[PDB]
Design a protein around this ligand. Structure first.
Ligand SMILES: O=C(N[C@H](C(=O)Nc1cnccc1-c1ccc(C(F)(F)F)cc1)c1cccc(C(F)(F)F)c1)c1cnccc1-c1ccc(C(F)(F)F)cc1
Lengths: 118, 120
């Protein structure tokens, strides 16, 4: 047993990360700004074990991966995501299980915001 | 305060409730026993606000709602709140599957289904 967080009330907490799904479709840049306004960033995938809840995510959602590195400038670690071509573009949609579909950054999509606690 | 729980280590926490999805298909009675083995119960729906994450649940899963011939009641013996679930009959049964958004499908208790456990 343990506690999870800290997270704001409207976020799912899993292994001390906070996740929130946004159903209003936006391009990658507008989604990034939305997460920032919530003291967060777009989903960053850094651990298959500590983020194994992402195996259960359905549909396709902006994550913070750009052409590959994350918003915060950090690199994509190997053996975390299978990146699959789909549409010509420089952004990627998260899909289960641990897949990234390359997508046009200007195409509206739903998105996942995430806050790390440490 | 800003922490959620307590909950078992690898469960999801939301508004101080803990949830775990089980992909193994079991009948209602086996699912109930599985949650109890983990010091939990099958999903109980009490608030569309506190449990609005249930709007995002895909597919159908056992919850702790049973018919006692009476009315629909939860495992713990408490009553189903009105205006919470829309109950839809499509099989002869005394048990119910949760489906989004805030629906309960009457289902044969013996039919294997995936299930959701919950702890508070
Ligand atoms: O992924 C979407 N739904 C699955 C789903 O239920 N998947 C299953 C598939 N097959 C079978 C079962 C599930 C499943 C069933 C019950 C639970 C339970 F234990 F919770 F009870 C969890 C999973 C999902 C995944 C993680 C957490 C939750 C939640 F906790 F909210 F219930 C739900 C989904 C679908 N449409 C739009 C948006 C989403 C979505 C996107 C991001 C996020 C996140 F996490 F990033 F915020 C959450 C939801």
């Amino acid at each position: 047993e343990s506690y999870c967080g800290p997270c704001p009330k409207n976020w799912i907490c899993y292994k001390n990360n906070c996740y929130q799904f946004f159903d209003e479709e936006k391009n990658w840049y507008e989604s990034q700004a939305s997460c920032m306004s919530q003291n967060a960033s777009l989903l960053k995938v850094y651990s298959k074990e500590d983020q194994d809840l992402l195996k259960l995510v359905k549909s396709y959602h902006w994550m913070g991966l750009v052409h590959w590195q994350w918003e915060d400038g950090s690199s994509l670690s190997p053996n975390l995501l299978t990146i699959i071509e789909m549409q010509k573009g420089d952004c990627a949609l998260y899909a289960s299980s641990f897949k990234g579909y390359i997508e046009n950054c200007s195409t509206p999509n739903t998105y996942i915001c995430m806050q790390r606690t440490v």
